[PDB]
Amino acid sequence: MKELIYIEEPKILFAHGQKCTDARDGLALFGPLNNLYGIKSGVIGTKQGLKIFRDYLDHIQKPIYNSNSITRPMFPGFEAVFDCKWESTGITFKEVTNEDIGKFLYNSSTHKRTYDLVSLFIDKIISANKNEDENVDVWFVIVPDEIYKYCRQFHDQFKARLLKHTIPTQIFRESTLAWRDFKNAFGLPIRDFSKIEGHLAWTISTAAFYKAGGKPWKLSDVRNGVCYLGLVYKKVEKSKNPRNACCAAQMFLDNGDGTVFKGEVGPWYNPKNGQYHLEPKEAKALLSQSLQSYKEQIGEYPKEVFIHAKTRFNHQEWDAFLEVTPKETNLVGVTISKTKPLKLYKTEGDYTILRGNAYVVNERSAFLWTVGYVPKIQTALSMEVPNPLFIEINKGEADIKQVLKDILSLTKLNYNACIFADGEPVTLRFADKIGEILTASTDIKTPPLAFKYY
RNA sequence: UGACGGCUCUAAUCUAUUA
DNA sequence: TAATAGATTAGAGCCGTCAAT
């Protein structure tokens, strides 16, 4: 019989310094940190798509209710939550006819049709950006449920191509905004959101508010002078080789004041297939870039660098890392994995193990429960029994207690969603996202480096 | 491309041995 | 220059998310 420890739930700081635990309740109670005066929407799509976006924008001005107000809080309305304006008066329609889509979708090759479709969309968007006097804050691409159905490659190539211009954008489908009318031939909706309409409104509003330059919440208590790196490896499929290792990183310092979260990127390439390791030159380049990007914004080098990863580091890349690291900087390499098939069971009956319990195997290895039961919403984050994260300190010296605490803290800032907390640290998740986007088109110089473009 | 969770399925690499 | 094999990694496609069957 072994023992479990408990890690206290982290706090996210809302407006006028009001700590809370749930992002939705903190927003519905206090509001986002900074105020946008309003959101100007540029909608590109068919006429039906324009009508769908219009009626959804008119719908989410009014309050939206979930089936149970405890498991999922109800949505008060966009202006109430965010003290902004995101309404149908600011729509700047750029029509795309259906015949133009048909001229491209009905070819043979999948690469050609996807390329032509992305070309039409991005060319219209770029023409609107360059030579129109409007100031569109976020572009909204309403794609019918006939484009993304047979284009898989649409989204990643889209975002990769629009990178040189830095235009925030957001993709929607009419099934997402008009699930009610997009039933099947049987007469039953395929995407039933009747009991979770408020949750969908929360997610959409949060994503759109962040893509327009608003910061909804931030970490409450994280010590200063410590930086975090999330390194992920992807496969460059369109290269000559079947696989080619691509390292993309997401950096997370706290700030001089608060909530800096950028992503130290510019993909580092390892040509040897299957070897998810960084050559000494690329390792030195990555660490130097991250250190400089911390330094010129803060002023002094970080006192602790926590290089998270889903892979174990070997010796060569590690000594490469310490080659470019200053003496005063503590450097730690943590490995987070979901491989271990451990599954605890609450013997008392219906519900699962409370989220936040750990199992310290030793000094340099522990299990953590990021997914579990949450008393505040009176329901677990998963349906089946949750899986733990095997957090093992691959390299360096660090307190496993503090490592688990920080890994549980970094699971809160998933700005792309409005959920209680993420099941993985957000550095790894966002590094994965921007690495997936940056490898779609292999010709980019100095990518934008800000998450609203990915 | 609303966002996650959980699933299965498909691969490749390293360490070893047996040529 | 081929086989099994533990351990370590990635990529891909899919269903559920209420209450009650």
Side-chain angles (χ1 to χ4, degrees), chain A residues 24-132 134-147 149-219 221-242 244-249 251-263 265-297:
Chain A
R24 299 168 308 265
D25 296 3
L27 277 175
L29 265 284
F30 315 116
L33 279 64
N34 73 337
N35 59 338
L36 318 179
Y37 300 124
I39 296 183
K40 284 167 259 62
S41 327
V43 185
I44 159 144
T46 77
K47 275 310 206 332
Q48 292 282 90
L50 197 275
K51 180 200 286 187
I52 258 46
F53 185 82
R54 273 209 195 278
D55 73 19
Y56 191 81
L57 259 203
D58 289 322
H59 159 78
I60 88 177
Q61 303 296 313
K62 302 175 286 187
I64 322 193
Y65 294 144
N66 296 293
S67 39
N68 189 245
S69 300
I70 282 146
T71 314
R72 301 142 196 269
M74 66 105 212
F75 186 56
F78 189 96
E79 344 78 32
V81 181
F82 284 122
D83 49 283
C84 297
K85 289 148 280 325
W86 184 45
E87 74 298 26
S88 184
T89 78
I91 310 325
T92 313
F93 190 36
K94 266 65 163 57
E95 198 186 301
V96 173
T97 200
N98 204 326
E99 293 56 355
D100 195 27
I101 287 162
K103 276 188 176 184
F104 304 136
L105 196 73
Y106 292 148
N107 187 297
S108 179
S109 177
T110 167
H111 197 325
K112 196 178 183 291
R113 55 171 161 191
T114 42
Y115 198 93
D116 291 339
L117 228 47
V118 177
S119 293
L120 138 75
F121 274 93
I122 78 144
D123 283 300
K124 275 203 160 111
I125 290 162
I126 292 163
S127 297
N129 176 42
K130 280 170 93 75
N131 35 77
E132 296 236 329
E134 66 217 32
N135 182 5
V136 173
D137 227 323
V138 175
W139 272 80
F140 294 91
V141 177
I142 315 311
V143 293
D145 49 2
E146 193 37 292
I147 273 185
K149 185 183 274 138
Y150 300 147
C151 274
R152 193 173 69 258
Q153 171 79 332
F154 188 62
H155 154 220
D156 35 21
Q157 190 202 187
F158 190 104
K159 299 266 176 164
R161 269 152 92 165
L162 280 189
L163 272 195
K164 49 200 312 276
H165 317 302
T166 73
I167 297 147
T169 169
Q170 161 85 48
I171 295 185
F172 288 117
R173 320 200 338 245
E174 296 81 342
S175 324
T176 285
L177 306 159
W179 51 279
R180 265 141 300 107
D181 47 63
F182 264 19
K183 313 174 183 67
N184 56 2
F186 181 72
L188 187 125
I190 309 86
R191 200 183 244 239
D192 202 79
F193 289 174
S194 53
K195 317 275 153 217
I196 68 161
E197 248 301 321
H199 179 49
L200 179 91
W202 267 113
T203 312
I204 289 194
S205 292
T206 309
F209 176 81
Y210 179 65
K211 272 161 187 181
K215 27 187 80 73
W217 65 78
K218 75 168 167 185
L219 278 207
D221 224 350
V222 154
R223 53 222 193 275
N224 42 328
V226 47
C227 170
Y228 298 71
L229 265 72
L231 317 201
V232 185
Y233 290 76
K234 312 286 280 189
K235 285 182 183 172
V236 195
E237 266 292 343
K238 271 222 268 284
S239 55
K240 285 205 299 181
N241 273 320
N244 191 345
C246 216
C247 177
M251 149 165 30
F252 196 156
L253 55 166
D254 173 75
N255 195 352
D257 322 322
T259 178
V260 164
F261 189 25
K262 258 164 256 162
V265 84
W268 298 267
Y269 289 85
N270 207 354
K272 34 168 58 85
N273 176 18
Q275 188 94 267
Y276 313 117
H277 299 273
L278 258 206
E279 309 299 323
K281 281 79 37 183
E282 320 170 25
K284 287 186 180 68
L286 194 151
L287 222 54
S288 298
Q289 178 174 346
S290 300
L291 279 193
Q292 198 64 42
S293 167
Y294 186 107
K295 173 204 201 75
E296 87 278 68
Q297 154 79 310

Side-chain angles (χ1 to χ4, degrees), chain A residues 71-72 351-355 371-375 377-383 386:
Chain A
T71 314
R72 301 142 196 269
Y351 304 148
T352 85
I353 158 175
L354 163 145
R355 161 205 213 263
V371 176
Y373 188 86
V374 178
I377 48 144
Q378 313 259 301
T379 279
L381 307 182
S382 67
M383 296 113 63

Side-chain angles (χ1 to χ4, degrees), chain A residues 317-382:
Chain A
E317 56 209 344
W318 202 253
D319 311 34
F321 283 153
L322 298 307
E323 190 47 270
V324 287
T325 328
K327 294 331 116 190
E328 207 269 331
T329 289
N330 166 354
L331 201 162
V332 178
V334 188
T335 295
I336 300 130
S337 151
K338 216 134 183 295
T339 57
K340 299 321 177 76
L342 182 60
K343 270 173 177 291
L344 293 206
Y345 281 75
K346 204 180 196 257
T347 63
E348 269 77 356
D350 212 338
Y351 304 148
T352 85
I353 158 175
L354 163 145
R355 161 205 213 263
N357 298 137
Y359 164 37
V360 176
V361 159
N362 49 45
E363 191 313 322
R364 280 160 80 89
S365 296
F367 289 78
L368 193 64
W369 263 269
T370 43
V371 176
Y373 188 86
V374 178
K376 275 178 53 113
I377 48 144
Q378 313 259 301
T379 279
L381 307 182
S382 67

